[PDB]
Amino acid sequence: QIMEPHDTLSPAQVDEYRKNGFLVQEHVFDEEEIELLRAEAAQEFASGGERVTVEIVRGVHGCHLYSEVFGRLVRSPRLLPIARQLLRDDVYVHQFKINAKRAFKGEVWEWHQDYTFWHHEDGMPAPRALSAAIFLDEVTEFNGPLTFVPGGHGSGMIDADVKGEGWANTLTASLKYSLDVETMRGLIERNGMVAPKGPRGSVLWFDANIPHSSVPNISPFDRGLVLITYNSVENKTDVTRGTRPEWLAARDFTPLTALQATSF
Amino acid sequence: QIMEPHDTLSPAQVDEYRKNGFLVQEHVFDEEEIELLRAEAAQEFASGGERVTVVRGVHGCHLYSEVFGRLVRSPRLLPIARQLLRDDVYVHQFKINAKRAFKGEVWEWHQDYTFWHHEDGMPAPRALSAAIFLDEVTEFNGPLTFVPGGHGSGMIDADVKGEGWANTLTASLKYSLDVETMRGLIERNGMVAPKGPRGSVLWFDANIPHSSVPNISPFDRGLVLITYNSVENKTDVTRGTRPEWLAARDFTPLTALQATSF
């Protein structure tokens, strides 16, 4: 049995990713594959316990450590070779989350950079990491797409106001590190905003330091995203500065290997 | 501590490799790295026992030498192997072929893939070799010589002159190519002997026909040859005969060496 040989991004793709900070590949996974991921996301929302964030189950963290399906997904040949290619290293999963934005539901998600959280909370030393967002549903103008500042990752970490204490979490409406109204204005005047769209089964790759935000879903269709954050193994987090649980910030830095086509 | 981020081939270099069957990168390893490799090679020639061919070469060193076991995971090599094979990869075979000043025999035309297919059960030629130049390779120290594009029609009919384990370190090869086959291939495609400085790496296709002659110079021509195979293309250990040091049986995917404090 055969896996399709690893496909990597073209040089134009790589260049677009590094310039803009994000890149969509359409139609990576087929409907049947997406349906398998959807059904498993539903199981994780049902069994995740403390790993679920409620709106009303709305998000779940760490599923690749608990679900065999999601454990295999992160090693997929459609994903792993590209993470390796863009991070120019072997890689591992720093964080896994599923964000479900149901039809006619959702809240505003404030402007934030993932790297701010991972640097300050988990001891990630550089922004040599990225997220792959699998589209469980078509992403449109109206179902609360992730919205970015293109090129906004290009000046690094932007100073934020520290709010709560204890375990930060980008999935909770009042973000521990959010971006200054004045800093956003300047970034946005210079660079614009873009909400990448695409069909069910696409993958949206985006930089650890890209500013992003989102709005509620006013459409009658769901917007499910499975988000896999790959980190460079050289860039492994400093587990001595972090104290989040493993399901928020991984501590096993073993390099991932690609799934092969076996008889089961 | 920091490794240089992984450097893969450009699309022009990939294209050249796919068309020609071989590609040189100059100056991959520095003098001091090469000297470390040369000194380890000398150790493997002295300590290798049954794995030495008499001293022409030695097989399997990455299984027995810590230095050579880290070499095959180098960030200079592994990422290119995975890129060209479009898979995770492992080491099918490792050999060191010393061709000393004013020494050597003629080494008949052959395709490595013929050997790995028949002897080891390699199912397809989804493999390559990285030859590290321990010395400058010139016109006069017996360079590996190729038919460019000669990998592009698969395995070429060869006669099975022998019993027992094939070894491609002998003048006398179990699967050689005859003057009539070669004459036509050479007439159509030509011959090329890629050159380069000490520390270069010559990449070449499992199915490219190649050859070499004696070294008629006062300069040695040491080569460390690492054969990477696609994990998906793992050999059938059912059809295999040979010891592990000729044909690997552990198909664990290789990971890149990180920069650590020791």
CSV table of C-alpha atoms in Angstrom, one decimal, chain A residues 18 80-92 128 230-236 253 255-256, chain B residues 3-8 75 78-79 82 255-259:
chain,number,residue,atom,x,y,z
A,18,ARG,CA,6.9,34.3,4.8
A,80,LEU,CA,4.3,17.0,8.4
A,81,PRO,CA,6.5,17.6,5.4
A,82,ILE,CA,5.3,21.2,5.0
A,83,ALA,CA,5.8,22.0,8.7
A,84,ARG,CA,9.4,20.6,8.4
A,85,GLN,CA,9.9,22.5,5.3
A,86,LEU,CA,8.7,25.9,6.6
A,87,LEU,CA,10.3,25.5,10.1
A,88,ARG,CA,13.5,24.1,8.4
A,89,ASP,CA,13.8,21.5,11.1
A,90,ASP,CA,12.4,18.4,12.5
A,91,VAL,CA,9.2,19.3,14.4
A,92,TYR,CA,6.8,18.3,17.2
A,128,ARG,CA,10.0,29.4,15.0
A,230,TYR,CA,4.1,22.6,15.1
A,231,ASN,CA,7.2,23.9,16.7
A,232,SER,CA,10.8,23.4,15.6
A,233,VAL,CA,12.6,20.8,17.8
A,234,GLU,CA,15.6,23.1,18.1
A,235,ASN,CA,13.0,25.7,19.3
A,236,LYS,CA,11.7,23.5,22.0
A,253,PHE,CA,10.0,17.0,22.0
A,255,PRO,CA,10.6,14.5,16.4
A,256,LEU,CA,7.6,13.5,14.5
B,3,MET,CA,22.3,24.0,14.0
B,4,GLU,CA,22.1,26.0,10.8
B,5,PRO,CA,18.4,25.7,9.7
B,6,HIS,CA,17.9,22.9,7.2
B,7,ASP,CA,19.0,23.8,3.7
B,8,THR,CA,17.3,21.8,0.9
B,75,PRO,CA,21.4,18.3,8.9
B,78,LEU,CA,19.2,14.1,5.9
B,79,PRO,CA,16.9,16.9,4.8
B,82,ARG,CA,14.0,13.2,2.5
B,255,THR,CA,15.7,12.1,12.7
B,256,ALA,CA,18.1,15.0,12.3
B,257,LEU,CA,21.0,15.6,14.7
B,258,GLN,CA,20.3,18.6,17.1
B,259,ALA,CA,23.1,20.9,18.4
